[PDB]
């Protein structure tokens, strides 16, 4: 029932958990408390798909076994700048160096 997620936007990554029964809107309330932006001015995404405020995380594919504490599911976040909404963009993490020779 518990899911663990990474809500991400640009170079911001919020680690948080919720329930499969919880709705997308309740997840937006959590983003609001942290980042001080109201649910109406945020868009949450699963991959490239917008998530409707009323639907549960379980219905949108977030399950206890895909959103694991040691491997959380990524949820995209996009804010509204005055009139329009920004496009979804997630800055990747740094890349590791090539495997050392003694490890290949």
């Amino acid at each position: 029932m518990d899911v663990f997620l990474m809500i991400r936007r640009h170079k911001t990554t919020i680690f948080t958990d919720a329930k499969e029964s919880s709705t997308v809107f309740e997840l937006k309330r959590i983003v609001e408390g942290i980042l001080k932006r109201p649910p109406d001015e945020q868009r949450l995404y699963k991959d490239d798909q917008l998530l409707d405020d009323g639907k549960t995380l379980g219905e949108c594919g977030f399950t206890s076994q895909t959103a694991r504490p040691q491997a959380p599911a990524t949820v995209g976040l996009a804010f509204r700048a005055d009139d329009t909404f920004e496009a979804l963009c997630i800055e990747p993490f740094s890349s590791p160096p090539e495997l050392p020779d003694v490890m290949k």
Partner: protein, 143 residues
């Protein structure tokens, strides 16, 4: 110090491997020597015959990483009330991130090549200190 009691009282146990590791059961004999027993694949269970008052610990069969049994380090079979066998639940501990990292690196680099890694020198001795049942037993005896 830590040794099995020669109770001569049979006790049936269910060795249950609830871990992703191949588990090596280790019985401490009456002289206190660790004595290895047959391995258990991940997610397998086996009903075994042991004796009341005997001491057992459980390790990764390949790396000797310590594992938990009934959420503790040591297991001692008890009385089988009503024919119920005793359950010994073998689980992964929550390792520290450092020890977990040492495990991954040990699994990827032959011991001869540790000092060819670009890491702080203190980690070389850390990598070479492979989990050791005899060493761990000496620490408990110091308790």
């Amino acid at each position: 110090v830590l040794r099995s009691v020669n109770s001569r009282e049979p006790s049936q146990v269910i060795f249950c491997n609830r871990s992703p590791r191949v588990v090596l059961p280790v019985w401490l004999n009456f002289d206190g020597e660790p004595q290895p027993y047959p391995t258990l694949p991940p997610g397998t269970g086996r009903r075994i015959h042991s004796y009341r008052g005997h001491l057992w610990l459980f390790r990764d069969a390949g790396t000797h990483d310590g594992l938990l049994v009934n959420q503790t380090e040591l297991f001692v079979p008890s009385l089988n009330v009503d024919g119920q066998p005793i359950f010994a639940n073998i689980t992964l501990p929550v390792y520290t991130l450092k020890e977990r990292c040492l495990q991954v690196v040990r699994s990827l680099v032959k011991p001869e090549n540790y000092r060819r890694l670009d890491i702080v020198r203190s980690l070389y001795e850390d990598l070479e200190d492979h989990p050791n049942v005899q060493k761990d037993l000496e620490r408990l005896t110091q308790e």
